[PDB]
XYZ file of C-alpha atoms in Angstrom:
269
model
C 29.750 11.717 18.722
C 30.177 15.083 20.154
C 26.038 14.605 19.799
C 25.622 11.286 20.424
C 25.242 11.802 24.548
C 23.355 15.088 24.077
C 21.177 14.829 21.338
C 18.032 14.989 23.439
C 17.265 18.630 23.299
C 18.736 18.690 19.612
C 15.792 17.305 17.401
C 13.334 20.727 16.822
C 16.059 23.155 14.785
C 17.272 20.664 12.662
C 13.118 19.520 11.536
C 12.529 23.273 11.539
C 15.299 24.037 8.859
C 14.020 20.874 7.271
C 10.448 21.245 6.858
C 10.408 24.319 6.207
C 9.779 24.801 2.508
C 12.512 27.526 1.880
C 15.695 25.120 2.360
C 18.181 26.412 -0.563
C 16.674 23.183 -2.174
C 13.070 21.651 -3.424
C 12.132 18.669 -2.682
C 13.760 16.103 -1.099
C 17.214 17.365 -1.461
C 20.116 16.310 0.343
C 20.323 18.392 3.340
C 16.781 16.625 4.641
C 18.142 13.157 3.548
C 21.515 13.975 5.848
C 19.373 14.918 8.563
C 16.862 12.300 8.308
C 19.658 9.403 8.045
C 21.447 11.420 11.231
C 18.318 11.356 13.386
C 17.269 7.900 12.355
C 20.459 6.783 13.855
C 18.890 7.953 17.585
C 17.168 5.350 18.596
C 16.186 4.954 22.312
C 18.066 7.832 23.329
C 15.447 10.255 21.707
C 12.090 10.176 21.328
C 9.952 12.950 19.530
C 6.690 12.599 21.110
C 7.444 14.108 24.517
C 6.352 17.308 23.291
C 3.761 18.491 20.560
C 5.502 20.881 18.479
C 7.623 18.052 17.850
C 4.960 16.090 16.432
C 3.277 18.913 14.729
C 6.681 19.403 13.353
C 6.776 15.852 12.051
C 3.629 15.885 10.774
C 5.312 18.561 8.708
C 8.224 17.271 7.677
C 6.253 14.299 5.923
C 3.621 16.058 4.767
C 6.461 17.978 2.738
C 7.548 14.960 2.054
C 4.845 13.720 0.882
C 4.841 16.823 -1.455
C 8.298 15.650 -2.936
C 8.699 12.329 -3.324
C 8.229 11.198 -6.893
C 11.532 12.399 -8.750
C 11.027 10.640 -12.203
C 13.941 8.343 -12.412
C 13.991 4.674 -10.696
C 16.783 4.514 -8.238
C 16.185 7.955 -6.424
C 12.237 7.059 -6.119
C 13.155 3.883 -4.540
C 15.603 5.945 -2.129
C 12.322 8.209 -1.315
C 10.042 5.659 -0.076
C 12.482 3.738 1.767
C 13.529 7.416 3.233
C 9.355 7.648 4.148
C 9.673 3.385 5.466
C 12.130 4.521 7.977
C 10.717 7.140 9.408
C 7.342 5.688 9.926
C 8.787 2.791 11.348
C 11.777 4.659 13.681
C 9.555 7.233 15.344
C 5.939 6.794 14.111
C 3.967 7.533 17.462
C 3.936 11.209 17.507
C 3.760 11.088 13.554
C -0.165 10.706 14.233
C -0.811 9.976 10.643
C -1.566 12.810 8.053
C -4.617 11.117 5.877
C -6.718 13.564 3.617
C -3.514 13.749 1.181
C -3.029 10.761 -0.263
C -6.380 11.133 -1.913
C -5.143 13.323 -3.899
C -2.572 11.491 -5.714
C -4.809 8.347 -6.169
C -7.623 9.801 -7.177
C -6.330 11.104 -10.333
C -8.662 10.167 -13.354
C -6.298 9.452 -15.896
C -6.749 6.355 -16.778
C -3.982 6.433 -19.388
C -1.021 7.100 -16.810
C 1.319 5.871 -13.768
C 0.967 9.083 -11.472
C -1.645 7.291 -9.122
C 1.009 4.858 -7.653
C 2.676 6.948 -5.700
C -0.409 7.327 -3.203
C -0.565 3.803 -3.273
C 2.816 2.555 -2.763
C 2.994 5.433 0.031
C -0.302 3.877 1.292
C 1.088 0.251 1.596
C 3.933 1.906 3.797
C 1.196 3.583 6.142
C -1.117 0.603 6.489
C 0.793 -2.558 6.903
C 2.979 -1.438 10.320
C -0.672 -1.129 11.713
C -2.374 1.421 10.833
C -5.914 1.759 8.910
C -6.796 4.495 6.426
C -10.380 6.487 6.306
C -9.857 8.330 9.498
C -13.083 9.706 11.318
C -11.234 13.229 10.897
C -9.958 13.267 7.314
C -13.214 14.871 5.536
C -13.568 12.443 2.503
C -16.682 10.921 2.053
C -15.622 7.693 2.433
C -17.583 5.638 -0.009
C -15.731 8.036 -2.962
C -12.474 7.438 -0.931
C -12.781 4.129 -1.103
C -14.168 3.877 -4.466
C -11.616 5.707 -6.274
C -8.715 3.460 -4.608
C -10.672 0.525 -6.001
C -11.184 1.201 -9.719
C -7.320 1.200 -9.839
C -7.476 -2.411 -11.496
C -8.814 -1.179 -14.753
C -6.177 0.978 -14.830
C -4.392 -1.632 -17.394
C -1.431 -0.287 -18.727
C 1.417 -0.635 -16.373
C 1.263 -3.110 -13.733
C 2.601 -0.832 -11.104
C -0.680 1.068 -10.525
C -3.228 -2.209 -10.269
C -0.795 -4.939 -8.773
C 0.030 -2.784 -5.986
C -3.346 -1.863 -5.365
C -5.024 -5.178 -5.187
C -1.789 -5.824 -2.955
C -2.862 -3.513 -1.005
C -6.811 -4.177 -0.845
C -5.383 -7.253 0.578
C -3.854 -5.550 3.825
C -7.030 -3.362 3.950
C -9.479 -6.235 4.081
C -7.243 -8.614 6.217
C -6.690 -5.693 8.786
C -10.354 -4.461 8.823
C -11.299 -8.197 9.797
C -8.323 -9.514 12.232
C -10.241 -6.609 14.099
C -13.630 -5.899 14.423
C -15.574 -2.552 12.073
C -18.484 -1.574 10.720
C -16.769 -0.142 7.413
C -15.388 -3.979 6.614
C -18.506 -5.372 4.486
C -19.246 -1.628 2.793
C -15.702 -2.376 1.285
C -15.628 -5.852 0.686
C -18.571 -6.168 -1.648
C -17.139 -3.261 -3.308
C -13.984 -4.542 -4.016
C -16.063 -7.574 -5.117
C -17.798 -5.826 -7.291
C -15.143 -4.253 -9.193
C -13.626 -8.299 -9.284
C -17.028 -8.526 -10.559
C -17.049 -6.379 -13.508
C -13.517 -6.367 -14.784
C -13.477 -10.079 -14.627
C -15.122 -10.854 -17.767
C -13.193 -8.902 -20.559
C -9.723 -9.403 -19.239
C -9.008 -12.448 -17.470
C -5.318 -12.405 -16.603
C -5.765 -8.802 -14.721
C -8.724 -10.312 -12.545
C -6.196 -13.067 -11.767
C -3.293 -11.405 -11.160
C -5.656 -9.155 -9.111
C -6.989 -11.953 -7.057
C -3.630 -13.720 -6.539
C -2.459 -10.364 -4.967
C -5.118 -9.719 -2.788
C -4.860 -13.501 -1.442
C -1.443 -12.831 -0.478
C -2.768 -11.183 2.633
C -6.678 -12.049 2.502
C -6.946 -15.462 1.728
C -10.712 -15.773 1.687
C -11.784 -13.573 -1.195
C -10.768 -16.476 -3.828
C -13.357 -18.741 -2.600
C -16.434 -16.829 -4.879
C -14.203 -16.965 -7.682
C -12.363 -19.946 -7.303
C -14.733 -22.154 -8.507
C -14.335 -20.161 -12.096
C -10.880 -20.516 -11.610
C -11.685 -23.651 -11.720
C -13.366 -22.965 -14.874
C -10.592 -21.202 -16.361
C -7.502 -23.621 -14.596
C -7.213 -25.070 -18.654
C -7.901 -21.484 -20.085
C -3.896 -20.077 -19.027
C -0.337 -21.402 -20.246
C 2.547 -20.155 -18.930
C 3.661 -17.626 -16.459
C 0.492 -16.771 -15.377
C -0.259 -20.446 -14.396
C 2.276 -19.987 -11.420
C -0.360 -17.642 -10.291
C -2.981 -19.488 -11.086
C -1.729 -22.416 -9.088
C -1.128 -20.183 -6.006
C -4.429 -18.550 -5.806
C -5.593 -22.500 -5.589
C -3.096 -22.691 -2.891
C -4.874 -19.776 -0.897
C -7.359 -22.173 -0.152
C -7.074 -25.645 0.439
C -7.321 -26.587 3.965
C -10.434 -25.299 4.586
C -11.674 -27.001 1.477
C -12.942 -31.098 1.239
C -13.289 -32.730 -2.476
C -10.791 -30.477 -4.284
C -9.041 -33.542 -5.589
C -11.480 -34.620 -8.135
C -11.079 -31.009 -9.299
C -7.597 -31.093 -9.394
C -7.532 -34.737 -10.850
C -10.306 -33.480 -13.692
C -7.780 -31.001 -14.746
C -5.135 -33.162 -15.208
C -2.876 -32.708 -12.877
C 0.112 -35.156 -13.916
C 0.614 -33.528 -17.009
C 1.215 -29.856 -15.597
């Protein structure tokens, strides 16, 4: 309270002793978690992005972030990306997004593993305030960029790589088409394609897969629905739940559906 009126000019010595990597601490240690949860508590009396070195100073403190935020056990990585949520949703305007990073940790071909969620979890955070991924600046070659997010769903061994990331296709494909792009179609057949393929060993991934992309882009279902329809007797159990639902992703745009419905006999389920 003695810094609650005049914490205006107080926001650059506190981020410098923070992101800067000697800190009598690595990684996310609890100095930079006090000072993020004290400057998170500033709202509309401060604001970071009247000056640049604050931002470049931001950019910093996530990227180092970004460097430490995986920390094995459960609770403390759930603590890390909500510490990451609130920052990119307090000041995020200055915090002009470091892409070019994140590439790194999904793109790791080990398709034995769980170190690729990270990236993607992280990259759920960054896209679904507003924001797109595959900046013009971030040198990536976009088609590998992209490609390498989207093989994630063969990655079948723990959910929490390939559930996420069709989760997050989702937000990519309904954000890319609420607004107009050129890059929409150049990732939509791709992510099609990969549907494509690992549809026809492994059935419950592609429809776990396609139940979590239609939670935010509905329309994808529609060229596979039809052998949902094929497979709607094929599941018992929990997966039917999700089976239903992806049904549910499309219905009012639909017309017979019914007969379908009926055919699989409905009364008894």
């Amino acid at each position: 309270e003695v810094f609650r009126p005049y914490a205006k000019h107080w926001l650059s010595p506190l981020l410098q002793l923070a992101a800067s990597e000697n800190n009598g601490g690595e990684g996310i240690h609890y100095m930079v978690v006090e000072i993020v949860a004290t400057i998170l508590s500033w709202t509309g009396l401060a604001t970071p992005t009247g000056v640049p070195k604050d931002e470049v100073l931001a950019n910093r403190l996530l990227n180092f972030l970004m460097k430490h935020v995986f920390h094995p056990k459960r609770a403390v990585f759930r603590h890390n990306l909500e510490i990451i949520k609130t920052l990119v949703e307090c000041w995020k305007d200055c915090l002009s997004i470091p892409y070019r990073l994140i590439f790194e940790k999904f793109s790791g071909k080990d398709p034995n593993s769980k170190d690729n969620s990270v990236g993607i979890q992280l990259l759920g955070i960054v896209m679904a305030n507003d924001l797109p991924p595959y900046d013009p600046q971030c040198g990536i070659q976009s088609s590998e960029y992209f490609q390498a997010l989207v093989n994630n769903m063969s990655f079948v061994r723990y959910k929490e790589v390939y559930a996420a990331a069709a989760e997050v296709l989702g937000l990519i494909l309904r954000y890319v088409m609420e607004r107009k792009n050129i890059l929409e179609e150049s990732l939509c057949e791709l992510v099609a394609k990969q549907l494509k393929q690992h549809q026809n060993t492994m059935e419950d991934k592609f429809i776990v897969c396609l139940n979590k992309v239609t939670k935010s882009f509905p329309p994808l279902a529609d060229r596979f629905m039809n052998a949902v329809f094929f497979l709607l007797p094929k599941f018992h159990g929990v997966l039917k739940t999700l089976c239903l639902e992806v049904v549910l992703c499309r219905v009012e745009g639909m017309t017979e559906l019914y007969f379908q419905l009926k055919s699989k006999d409905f009364v008894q389920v």
